[PDB]
Design a protein around this ligand. Structure first.
Ligand SMILES: CC(=O)N[C@@H]1[C@@H](O)[C@H](O[C@@H]2O[C@H](CO)[C@@H](O[C@@H]3O[C@H](CO)[C@@H](O)[C@H](O)[C@H]3NC(C)=O)[C@H](O)[C@H]2NC(C)=O)[C@@H](CO)O[C@H]1O
Length: 129
């Protein structure tokens, strides 16, 4: 499913991601935009043999099991396929484990390089939240 900007914002807010660990809703929407382009079905292979899955591009080396990643940890105890559902619940709950202390949202390369330190408030502009 390809979410709309406000559509995803409302869903993330409903799941308690707004200000989660101090990260405003705009940070999470911005991360989703640049990681998956708001597409829950996005998958991207990595040089280390791992693969990123879903709207928040969660990695198969540490967080979910995809059955083909050497040294997989599956810290979120879910198959990576669960992160591709139109329902973002699994992605949100895993993202909450990832951002909790560690290095927080620095775990997301797109967030660090395109959201961190930027005007993230703009990502929820016009949204009825
Ligand atoms: C969104 C996403 O999946 N991003 C992936 C990153 O999470 C991943 O980074 C590595 O993550 C692991 C697990 O959190 C890091 O290990 C943790 O490191 C902290 C210190 O910062 C330590 O306190 C934790 O105990 C330790 N956890 C465990 C279980 O050992 C690890 O340092 C990260 N590695 C790097 C280079 O950042 C990266 C790389 O696998 O992939 C992203 O896709």
């Amino acid at each position: 499913k390809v979410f709309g900007r406000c559509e995803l914002a409302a869903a993330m807010k409903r799941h308690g991601l707004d200000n989660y660990r101090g990260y405003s809703l705009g940070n999470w929407v911005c991360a989703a935009k640049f990681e998956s382009n708001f597409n829950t079905q996005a998958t991207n292979r990595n040089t280390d043999g791992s693969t990123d899955y879903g709207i928040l591009q969660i990695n198969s080396r540490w967080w979910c099991n995809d059955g083909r990643t050497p040294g997989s940890r599956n810290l979120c105890n879910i198959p990576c396929s669960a992160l591709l559902s139109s329902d973002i619940t699994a992605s949100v709950n895993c993202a909450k484990k990832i951002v909790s202390x560690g290095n927080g949202m620095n775990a997301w390369v797109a967030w660090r390089n395109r959201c961190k330190g930027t005007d993230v408030q703009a990502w929820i502009r016009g949204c009825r939240l």
